[PDB]
């Protein structure tokens, strides 16, 4: 929309949100981990199957810097829109039948709304800088639902472990990305 939005203003709050959302994801993940896998022998296993990994992303900074700006910003939107369904199901899954984690839920609800909040911001950024960008419509599919809703404690709990991990990973991606774009478009520029 509008309400006197400048590109400086858009980025100002895009970075405030992306930093917040990431820190909240580390909080959520570290809390789940502690609370949910600290007395058990569950397998850590690193950077597992993240649904956003199918999309072309820079896995570096010079790679990100070198990148076409138009594609970079659309990438950011695709990631953010791909976290809709899994974040809806997370909240519904904690919320539904499921018990205690009133504290993890409280946090899932915020991540869910703040992401959507970030996406509109990002959509405006794009319209302002690259209005020639066409309706995005490409976003990676998510298939973790079956694994979230398993009877087997180890399977289900790890499916949660991994989704929170991936989320903490990707919210960290977006943050580095937005810093990099803000520093360029708004701040100290090479001419």
Q: Tokens 């810097």 identify what position?
A: 65
- C-beta atoms surrounding 156 within 10 Å: 15
* C-alpha to C-alpha distance for 70 and 62, rounded to whole angstroms: 16
Helix axes 84-95, 69-82, angle to 10 degrees: 20
CA distance 57 to 146: 27
Q: Are 82 and 142 in contact (CB under 8 A)?
A: yes
Spell out the domains of the chain, with CATH numbers in brackets.
1-191 (1.20.1250.10)
**Are 170 and 83 contacting, i.e. CB atoms less than 8 angstroms apart?**
yes
Nearest to 6 by CA among 185, 184, 160: 185
Determination technique for this entry: X-ray
User: What distance, in Å, lies between the first and last C-alpha atoms of the chain?
Assistant: 30
**Residues near 103 by Cβ (< 8 Å), separated by ≥ 6?**
31
How many secondary structure helices (H) and strands (E) does the chain include? 7, 0
Q: With beta carbons less than 8 A apart as the criterion, state whether 3 and 120 touch.
A: no
């Amino acid at each position: 929309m509008r309400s006197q939005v400048t590109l400086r203003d858009l980025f100002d709050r895009a970075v405030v949100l992306s930093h917040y959302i990431h820190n909240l994801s580390s909080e959520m993940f570290s809390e789940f981990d502690k609370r949910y896998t600290h007395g058990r022998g569950f397998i850590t296993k690193a950077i597992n199957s993240c649904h956003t990994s199918s999309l072309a992303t820079p896995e570096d900074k010079e790679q990100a810097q070198q990148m076409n700006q138009k594609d970079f910003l659309s990438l950011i939107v695709s990631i953010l829109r791909s976290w809709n369904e899994p974040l809806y199901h997370l909240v519904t899954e904690v919320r539904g039948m499921q018990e205690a984690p009133e504290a993890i839920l409280s946090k899932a609800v915020e991540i869910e709304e703040q992401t959507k909040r970030l996406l509109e911001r990002m959509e405006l950024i794009v319209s302002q800088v690259h209005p020639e960008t066409k309706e995005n419509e490409i976003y990676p599919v998510w298939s973790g639902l079956p694994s979230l809703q398993m009877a087997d404690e180890e399977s289900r709990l790890s499916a949660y472990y991994n989704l929170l991990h991936c989320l903490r990973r990707d919210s960290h991606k977006i943050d580095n990305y937005l810093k990099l774009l803000k520093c360029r478009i708004i701040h100290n520029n090479n001419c």
